[PDB]
Amino acid sequence: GYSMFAVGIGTLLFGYWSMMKWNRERRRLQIEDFEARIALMPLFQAEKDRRVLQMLRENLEEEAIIMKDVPDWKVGESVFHTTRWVTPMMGELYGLRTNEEILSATYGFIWYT
């Protein structure tokens, strides 16, 4: 009776100590790769800004070509009263593009398994 309980608690304490050490190491490693991501973030931000702006400009040029016959249509007219930057809705970015890359931009991360 006593011996069985003593062995059980001893095993539990050994496991607790081992897992404490391993989990502290895991937290340190996670901090490290989070720092790697933080170091890489500004470059990704710059490229994302340029990519979004180029897609919007290409859509603007194509819309200028397409809507030259409609009489009372302003090219690149906002739908907001405010003049500050509004983050583009992904429908605007991929509105005039093919179905496969729209499926990509919409469901690629969710469907990736």
């Binding site: 180029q54 809705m89 093919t98």
Partner: protein, 105 residues
């Protein structure tokens, strides 16, 4: 009717969850954080009756961000005109809207 215990005691039982622009975990922003912030700062302290008239611009922008109805109508109009032009063959879509672009990082 409304016994306003929270403000009397400074308790904050549920006010942390009422608006989209209020202290999210890990500073994750709402999709319409700027619009709601502008509308709330416009309408603060002037009363509901005055806010319904004098902050209509901010509220309309906030609603447009929420539902994107005007954006969808504009995209539909552009797509319809493009389809009409392509069916008759007057307009030809460029390579970079057909999958033949030069991608960038």
């Amino acid at each position: 009717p409304f016994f306003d215990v929270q403000k009397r005691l400074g308790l904050d039982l549920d006010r942390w969850m009422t608006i989209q622009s209020a202290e999210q975990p890990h500073k994750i922003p709402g999709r319409c954080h700027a619009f709601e912030k502008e509308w709330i700062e416009c309408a603060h302290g002037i009363g509901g009756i005055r806010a319904e008239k004098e902050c209509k611009i901010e509220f309309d922008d906030f609603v447009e961000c929420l539902l994107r109805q005007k954006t969808m109508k504009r995209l539909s109009a552009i797509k319809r005109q493009r389809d009409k032009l392509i069916k008759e063959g007057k307009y030809t879509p460029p390579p970079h809207h057909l999958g033949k672009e030069d991608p960038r990082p």
